[PDB]
Amino acid sequence: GVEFISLLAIILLSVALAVGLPGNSFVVWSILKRMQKRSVTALMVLNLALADLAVLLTAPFFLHFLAQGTWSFGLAGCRLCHYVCGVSMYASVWLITAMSLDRYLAVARPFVSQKLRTKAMARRVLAGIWVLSFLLATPVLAYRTVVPWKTNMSLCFPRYPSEGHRAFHLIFEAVTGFLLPFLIVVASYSDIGRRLQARRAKALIVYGSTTGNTEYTAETIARELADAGYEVDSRDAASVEAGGLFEGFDLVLLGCSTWGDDSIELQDDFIPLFDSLEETGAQGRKVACFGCGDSSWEYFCGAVDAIEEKLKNLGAEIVQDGLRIDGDPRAARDDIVGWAHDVRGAIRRFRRSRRTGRLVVLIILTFAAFWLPYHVVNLAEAGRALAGQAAGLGLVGKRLSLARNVLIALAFLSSSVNPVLYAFAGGGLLRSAGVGFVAKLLEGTGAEFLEVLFQ
Ligand SMILES: CC(C)(C)S(=O)(=O)NC(=O)c1ccc(F)cc1-c1ccc2c(c1)OC[C@H](Cc1ccccn1)[C@H]2O
Ligand SMILES: Cc1cc2nc3c(=O)[nH]c(=O)nc-3n(C[C@H](O)[C@H](O)[C@H](O)COP(=O)(O)O)c2cc1C
Ligand SMILES: CCCCCCCC/C=C\CCCCCCCC(=O)OC[C@H](O)CO
Ligand code: NA
């Protein structure tokens, strides 16, 4: 029902008040009072808490409205309470946009981030975001009014001069209060993620086996590589053409056994490849050889030596010494899957930074979870009002206008998810990564604790 929807509203505003006001203000006290040094990150956390705290200080007024069913605080109260809510929206969305822009700058131009990430630049953008927020929410101070409707029942309702004004306000609120700032956020984090990304590695394993021993070693190093995130291509040397064979593979592993009667001869299937190994494109390519033999013969795995000699003479970068298996290969399986490990580490790409901003993407995602649905029903009510002129009713509008009343209560809830996220990510991982390591950070003024939470 319509009052059943309001039942969800009073609890959502109340639970947000219960989790928000203690949490957000505990954050503020531990920055003003506890931290004698307000760092750039702490200044951002403080303002994000101040924004969330202000909107929660008006929820009690909107509880009295839901309870008594009428507004008893006057025109100025209905004006002010909605104005400090609007600035809390525009501030929180541009402050998280700032955090995302500070992170892109830190990875894109590290010298410029080091140059401009000062407490002065912080206080300038913070005060700048605040001034920008106040003048973007002023339209609410004129579109809100207390109008008596039904007996002893007054509504703090948004009255517009026309549906064109209602449509402009809603699309302006949607664009300046979400679409435009979050478009800057997604572009930042897409570029941050487009840098760390890396195509999956491709490896080629061409083997020449007559009795199946080399085929076993090829298949075991193929399984070793594949389990480490490789795209292995295992081919018998009797079904391959030398022309452009290696083209496309970051790593090439050639295996072959020795088969000379009174000599060092190559395996039958491998001989045609070897004689045309120049057409493979081995020049400047990462390669490592393997193969089986028998120590009883005068030249143990002479095939591996001859192949490695040609690859070297063709300009190939031999990354590991040849894997020379004596006798039954499965009898030495660890030496095989261990040789494949060292080959990977010999060409392994640089270890990407293990400090990924999981906390800020949590703050951004949660903020997006509550405000994206609120701003699309704004756009949906605006698209209707721009032509259909429906408001508070309709066919889908009967469900849209009810959807706004639910998302409004959820908006008060978004103001209480940042402090729990601070503690959620903090205790969940730092305490789980050394309880003693945490105290050493907290023993100081407290600035190093916050910076470690934000990675
Ligand atoms: C057209 C309607 C009938 C829905 S109304 O619009 O008449 N409803 C109310 O007036 C209303 C009634 C009961 C109640 F408990 C709360 C509200 C309420 C409270 C605040 C706001 C509301 C609505 O809509 C905009 C903005 C959102 C916001 C932004 C930032 C943080 C949180 N919320 C903020 O100004
Ligand atoms: C006729 C013959 C000649 C061989 N010559 C050599 C050799 O010259 N050097 C060597 O290390 N092993 C030699 N071997 C041993 C093989 O390399 C060994 O059996 C190996 O496991 C063969 O592996 P594969 O056939 O599965 O590829 C020879 C084996 C045979 C049957
Ligand atoms: C619709 C109303 C809302 C308006 C929304 C806009 C708010 C301003 C946002 C970004 C401005 C800053 C963008 C540029 C920040 C990077 C500057 C930089 O990279 O610094 C290089 C400098 O030249 C080395 O000294
Ligand atoms: Na907020």
Numbering used by the authors: 13 to 212, 1002 to 1150, 213 to 318
Passage from the reporting paper:
Leukotriene B4 (LTB4) is a pro-inflammatory lipid mediator and potent chemoattractant acting via two G protein-coupled receptors (GPCRs), the LTB4 receptors 1 (BLT1) and 2 (BLT2). hBLT1 was first identified and cloned in 1997 by Yokomizo et al. as a high-affinity LTB4 receptor. hBLT2, which shares a 32% sequence identity with hBLT1, was discovered three years later and is characterized as a low-affinity receptor (20-fold lower affinity for LTB4). BLT1 regulates inflammation-related processes such as recruitment of neutrophils, monocytes, and T cells, as well as smooth muscle cell chemotaxis and proliferation. BLT1 belongs to the γ branch of class A GPCRs along with the chemokine and opioid receptors, among others.
The hBLT1 construct used for structure determination was engineered to facilitate crystallization in lipidic cubic phase (LCP) by truncating N-terminal residues 1–4 and C-terminal residues 311–352, fusing flavodoxin with an arginine-arginine linker in the third intracellular loop (ICL3) between residues 212 and 213, and introducing five thermostabilizing point mutations (L1063.41W, S1163.51Y, A1965.53I, C2877.55F, and S310A; superscripts represent Ballesteros-Weinstein nomenclature). The hBLT1 structure in complex with MK-D-046 was solved in an orthorhombic P 21 2 21 space group with one monomer per asymmetric unit at an anisotropic resolution truncated at 2.9, 2.9, 3.6 Å in the a*, b*, c* directions, respectively. The hBLT1 structure, captured in the inactive state, adopts the canonical seven transmembrane helical (7TM) fold of class A GPCRs. MK-D-046, a BLT1-selective antagonist (cAMP IC50: hBLT1 = 2 nM24, hBLT2 = no ligand response), was modeled in the prominent electron density inside the orthosteric ligand-binding pocket of hBLT1. The guanidine group of R1564.64 also engages in a stacking interaction with the imidazole ring of H943.29, which, as a 3N-H tautomer, forms hydrogen bonds with both the carbonyl sulfonamide group and the hydroxyl group of the chromanol core of MK-D-046.
